[PDB]
């Protein structure tokens, strides 16, 4: 509906999947797309390409809204951690402030036991 032109991209990129959501500067989500929904499942859900595809099909999800000043707020140690920004730029968004908001505990809670593979 209402154009915004000053949104923000949240890229939750983990080791298994990439979730990219274009929201407003108030945090209100406008659109979202995942590597698992772009058309990938399994070893392909976690490929830097899948995150690129998810970002490029999330960009065209938010077309009725504003486009001018998307900014990236990537989070998580995902394989699709920079290809998402590539796709966002290729879609036609100028990135003003690109930042990392990965949650780092300052100690925090005990992590799960290590996998014995």
């Amino acid at each position: 509906r209402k154009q915004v032109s000053d949104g923000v991209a949240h890229i939750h990129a983990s080791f298994n999947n990439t979730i990219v959501t274009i929201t407003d500067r108030q945090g209100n989500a406008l659109g979202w797309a995942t590597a698992g929904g772009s058309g990938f499942r399994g070893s392909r859900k976690s490929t830097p390409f899948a995150a690129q595809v998810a970002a490029e099909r999330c960009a065209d999800a938010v077309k009725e809204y504003g486009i001018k000043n998307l900014e990236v707020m990537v989070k998580g140690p995902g394989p699709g951690r920079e290809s998402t920004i590539r796709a966002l730029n290729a879609a036609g968004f100028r990135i003003t402030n690109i930042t990392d908001v990965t949650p780092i505990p300052h100690x925090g809670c005990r992590p799960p036991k290590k996998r014995r593979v």
């Binding site: 990938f40 070893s43 392909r44 490929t47 830097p48 390409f49 899948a50």
Partner: protein
């Protein structure tokens, strides 16, 4: 091989057209080491194609060939027990050889009377993107584009 000292082998051109590509075609269609029979079959099929196409006797062959060449192949690579088939580009000589082999094996998998008729039909059908060799090209392209994520 490990040494990788292989070079290139010169193939004498086709006597009737002076083309190394058509010589390679005659040579691929060979069975049990018979240059003369394969050459006769290729010549007859090309004459039929030229008569029914009106382009040329070598340009029409290249037109049919262009519509069946693959622009990308896929090479297997196991990672964790499962396969990770990675797409790779195909060198021009390899894509020529692949298209030519596909055309020959598609012509062999037909039901016409003689091999010359089978091959002429196959090239005519490939020039229109309707033969089974073109179907194999399309399947290879689609399956190499499906797992494009692995093309690092």
């Amino acid at each position: 091989p490990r040494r990788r000292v292989i070079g290139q082998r010169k193939i004498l051109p086709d006597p009737k057209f002076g083309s190394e590509l058509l010589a390679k075609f005659v040579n691929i269609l060979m069975v049990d080491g018979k240059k003369s029979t394969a050459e006769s079959i290729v010549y007859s099929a090309l004459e039929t194609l030229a008569q029914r196409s009106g382009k040329s006797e070598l340009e029409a062959f290249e037109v049919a060939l262009e519509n069946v060449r693959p622009t990308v192949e896929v090479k297997s690579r196991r990672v964790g027990g499962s396969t990770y088939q990675v797409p790779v580009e195909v060198r021009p000589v390899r894509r020529n050889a692949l298209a030519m082999r596909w055309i020959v094996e598609a012509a062999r998998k037909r039901g016409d009377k003689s091999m010359a008729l089978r091959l002429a039909n196959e090239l005519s059908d490939a020039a229109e993107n309707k033969g089974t060799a073109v179907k194999k090209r399309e399947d290879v392209h689609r399956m190499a584009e499906a797992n494009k994520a692995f093309a690092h």
